[PDB]
């Protein structure tokens, strides 16, 4: 094993956030600098997820090398109802990956558009793969 393991990534995240704050940069500032200085800008959202390890170990591993260059050098949409959420969570608990059919049922059952439900389960499986 050559790449950073989980404990090391947690330390890098710690260090990165300290340096950013020490230097007076916002998460947004860093994301913008990454595009200006290294050719790949990142959003405030991604910088926030990285610093909190709210990403999978696979994604954190891709990003760490990129953010490390910065560190060295610096030196219509629909909103889901509260009750529908809980039920959705309950379902996720039963089956993490419902089929197109299971899903269609669950949609009508909750009276929600199919695509919205398909996406909710996709987002939920992704969140479950996050470190934090």
Partner DNA sequence: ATGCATGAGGA
Partner DNA sequence: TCCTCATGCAT
Q: Which residue ranges make up the site for its own copies (CB under 8 A)?
A: 1-13, 38-40, 42-43, 45-46, 48-50, 52-69, 125-132
Residue placing its CB nearer to DNA in the complex, 45 or 109: 45
Q: What is the C-alpha to C-alpha distance for residues 53 and 46, in angstroms, rounded to an integer?
A: 10
Min dist. Cβ of residue 111 to DNA (A): 15
Residue placing its CB nearer to its own copies in the complex, 96 or 109: 96
Rounded to 10°, the helix 57-74/6-22 angle is: 40
Residue placing its CB nearer to its own copies in the complex, 22 or 69: 69
Q: What is the C-alpha to C-alpha distance for residues 84 and 81, in angstroms, rounded to an integer?
A: 5
Q: What is the C-alpha to C-alpha distance for residues 117 and 119, in angstroms, rounded to an integer?
A: 5
82 binds, among DNA, its own copies, none (CB under 5 to 8 A by kind): none
Q: How far is CA 97 from CA 72, 92, 101, in A?
A: 42, 8, 11
Q: What is the C-alpha to C-alpha distance for residues 82 and 21, in angstroms, rounded to an integer?
A: 35
Binding site for DNA (CB under 7 A): 1-4, 7-15, 18-19, 22, 31, 41-46, 48-49, 52, 54-56, 58-59, 62-65, 68, 71-72, 75, 77-80, 85, 97, 100, 103, 115-116, 118-123, 125-127, 129
């Amino acid at each position: 094993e050559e790449p950073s393991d989980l404990e090391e990534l947690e330390q890098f995240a710690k260090t990165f956030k300290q340096r950013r704050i020490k230097l007076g940069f916002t998460q947004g500032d860093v994301g913008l600098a990454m595009g200006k200085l290294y050719g790949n800008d990142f959003s405030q959202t991604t910088i926030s997820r990285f610093e909190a390890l709210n990403l999978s170990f696979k994604n954190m591993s891709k990003l760490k090398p990129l953010l490390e260059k910065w560190l060295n050098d610096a030196e219509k949409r629909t909103s889901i109802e509260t009750n529908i959420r809980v039920a959705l969570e309950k379902s996720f608990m039963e089956n993490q990956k419902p089929t197109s059919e299971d899903i269609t049922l669950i949609a009508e059952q909750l009276n929600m558009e199919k695509e919205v439900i398909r996406v909710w389960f996709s987002n939920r499986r992704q969140k479950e793969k996050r470190i934090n």
